[PDB]
Write a protein that binds this ligand. Structure first.
Ligand SMILES: *[C@@H]1O[C@H](CO)[C@@H](O[C@@H]2O[C@H](CO)[C@@H](O)[C@H](O)[C@H]2NC(C)=O)[C@H](O)[C@H]1NC(C)=O
Lengths: 200, 212, 215
């Protein structure tokens, strides 16, 4: 057991898009939740299924650090049940979800004059993303009956859209970096723990 | 078991210094965020300051920024709050509370010590008649300092419709109340109805006749 | 500029269930945990709900925390009410911009007697006070339950911003409450307007009293 890489998932440089939501499997290390709850610098920081206080006395099989960027006004959907354009076609959290949602404002990084179109999101998907499902299909959404087979026009829509992150946008339209932590409960050896190193 | 005791509160006129201190006992003090939450009398709760569990980073409301200095001491299981250059708004009951982590959970609340900021000094009240319109009459105990104040009706004989209301704490740092007695409309004209005021903190006893 | 708004008073009978709301102003509840502190009169607050829905060790099942996903507001529901639950309930949370914010508080009154509107008596400045170059209007409220009212002053049926002094309701001998409201003034203003009003709001209904200077 060692210390986990939270200084990389959070203190990162480039972030993925919501439809292509990143993920980093964490195992073989005893974490350090101090920098996370004592942070006080995030905007949205809630845990569903466990109190951040009683985490250092807990151990886990694996920890999943899903990280992506969405406009702040949409962080409300990164939570169980909560729906919308992000929880339906981009990233859906299960009802029995047991983890934490951590997000912070980042327009000082992901907002370039004229629009930092590096971040995208999904507009159409015939299927609502099943809990943790991924829809990175670039297939032209066939709006109408006549197929598309290529470039768009009517009845043909490029399923992805962009984010015009400008440093002057509204407090809600600004980009926010999210981190969704998942916790694994398996009857197998546990390689993740909090300051509970007395059990190895 | 957990308990928190605050001391160092009292009375001081505007601009003076004061230093509140909280005595922690019952938990691993070196593991919680210590905050000062004040509550003005008759008003709601308002957070004031919060010091980190290792003394690294402190936070305060913008109301007291630059005048209130939160400070802790892990070894002595204590928390302090230097209140320099006080104002009248700061008058409230200050409580020291435990947090654990940043987001919420103001877990335990000590009983808290009172902090009064008023320049006004002991002064006797001015009594004014109320003159009825059944109808009621009374007296007005205006601009007196330290509460208490006692009002008697007809030298202690009348006790029927007496209702001595509590006193407000006017903006001037001076209290003021009024007591009114409901008496029959047929009594006004014959009964005398004199009110008796005794402000023992200044030993200024004032009697006032009330007439229609 | 993220405030927390909360109703003034909610009243319900002993066995019934009541709900206290806590709405978020510019900002967004549900983005952070929500707490509910119970404060009985003259006592320090105790935590009844922490982390939007968890009751600490010892808090009865009657207290439940909910965080509405639609109206951006959390609500505390004390089911199967008890007379001991009559207190002041404040809701608190945290925001990145503004730090730990509290609600305005709600006076939950467990009705022990029938609701009663208040009796308002207004007194104009005494002839002797005016001779002293000072005027004061006395508005004495009484015999009302539940224990909370709102006092509003109207200058010839117009808002009266400053100069108002108003007490906090206190308990009478008969379990009803009472409080007084004093309006500071000057002799010129007293005889200038046609009449001054004293409006007292109590559980919806509003009672009023007005006085005219000249005699
Ligand atoms: C990851 O980022 C956080 C946030 O800035 C860093 O925490 C800061 O650490 C410095 C010490 O170098 C302190 O002076 C700051 O007060 C900390 N910030 C906060 C908000 O507490 C953290 O050090 C970074 N991690 C690494 C490995 O560099």
């Amino acid at each position: 057991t060692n210390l986990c890489p939270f200084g990389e998932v959070f203190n990162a440089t480039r972030f993925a898009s919501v439809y292509a939501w990143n993920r980093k499997r964490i195992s073989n290390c005893v974490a350090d939740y101090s920098v996370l709850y004592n942070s006080a610098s995030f905007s949205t920081f809630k845990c569903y299924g466990v109190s951040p206080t009683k985490l250092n006395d807990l151990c886990f099989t694996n920890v999943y650090a899903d990280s992506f960027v969405i406009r702040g006004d949409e962080v409300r959907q990164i939570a169980p049940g909560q729906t919308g354009k992000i929880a339906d076609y981009n990233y859906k959290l299960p009802d029995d979800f047991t983890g934490c949602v951590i997000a912070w404002n980042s327009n000082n990084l992901d907002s370039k004059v004229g629009g930092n179109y590096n971040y995208l999101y999904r507009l159409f998907r015939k299927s609502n993303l099943k809990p943790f499902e991924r829809d990175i299909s670039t297939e032209i959404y066939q709006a109408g009956s006549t197929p598309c087979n290529g470039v768009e026009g009517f009845n043909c829509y490029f399923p992805l859209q962009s984010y015009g992150f400008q440093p002057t946008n509204g407090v809600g339209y600004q980009p926010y970096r999210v981190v969704v932590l998942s916790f694994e409960l398996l009857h197998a050896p546990a390689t993740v723990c909090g300051p509970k190193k007395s059990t190895n | 078991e957990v308990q928190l005791v605050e001391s160092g509160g009292g009375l001081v006129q505007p601009g003076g210094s004061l230093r509140l201190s909280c005595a922690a006992s019952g938990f691993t003090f070196s593991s919680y965020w210590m905050s000062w939450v004040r509550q003005a009398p008759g008003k709601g709760l308002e957070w004031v300051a919060n010091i980190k569990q290792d003394g690294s980073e402190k936070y305060y409301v913008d109301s007291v920024k630059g005048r209130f200095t939160i400070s802790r001491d892990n070894a002595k299981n204590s928390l302090y709050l230097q209140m320099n250059s006080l104002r009248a708004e700061d008058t409230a009951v200050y409580y020291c509370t435990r947090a654990g982590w940043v987001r919420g959970a103001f877990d335990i609340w000590g009983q808290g010590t009172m902090v009064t900021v008023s320049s006004a000094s002991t002064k006797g009240p001015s009594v004014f008649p109320l003159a009825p319109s059944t109808a009621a009459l009374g007296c007005l105990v205006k601009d007196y300092f330290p509460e208490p104040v006692t009002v008697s009706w007809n030298s202690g004989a009348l006790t029927s419709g007496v209702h001595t209301f509590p006193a407000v704490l006017q903006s001037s740092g001076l209290y003021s109340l009024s007591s009114v007695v409901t008496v029959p409309s047929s009594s006004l004209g014959t009964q005398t109805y004199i009110c008796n005021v005794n402000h023992k903190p200044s030993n200024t006893k004032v009697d006032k006749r009330v007439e229609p | 500029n993220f405030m927390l708004t909360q109703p003034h008073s909610v009243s319900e009978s002993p066995g019934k269930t009541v709900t206290i709301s806590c709405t978020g102003s510019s900002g967004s509840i549900a983005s952070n945990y929500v707490q509910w502190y119970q404060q009985r009169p003259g006592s320090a607050p105790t935590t009844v709900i922490y982390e939007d829905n968890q009751r600490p060790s010892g808090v009865p099942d009657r207290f439940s925390g909910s965080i509405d996903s639609s109206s951006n507001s959390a609500s505390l529901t004390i089911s199967g009410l008890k007379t001991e639950d009559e207190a002041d309930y404040y809701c608190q949370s945290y925001d990145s911009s503004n730090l730990w914010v509290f609600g305005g508080g709600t006076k939950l009154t467990v009705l022990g007697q029938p609701k009663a509107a208040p009796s308002v008596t207004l007194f104009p400045p005494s002839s002797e006070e005016l001779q002293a170059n000072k005027a004061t209007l006395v508005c004495l409220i009484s015999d009302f339950y539940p224990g909370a009212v709102t006092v509003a002053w109207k200058a010839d049926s117009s808002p009266v911003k400053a100069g108002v002094e108003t007490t906090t309701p206190s308990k009478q001998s008969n379990n009803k409450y009472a409080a007084s409201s004093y309006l500071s003034l000057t002799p010129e203003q007293w005889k200038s307007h046609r009449s001054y009003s004293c409006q007292v709001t109590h559980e919806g209904s509003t009672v009023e009293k007005t006085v005219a200077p000249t005699e």
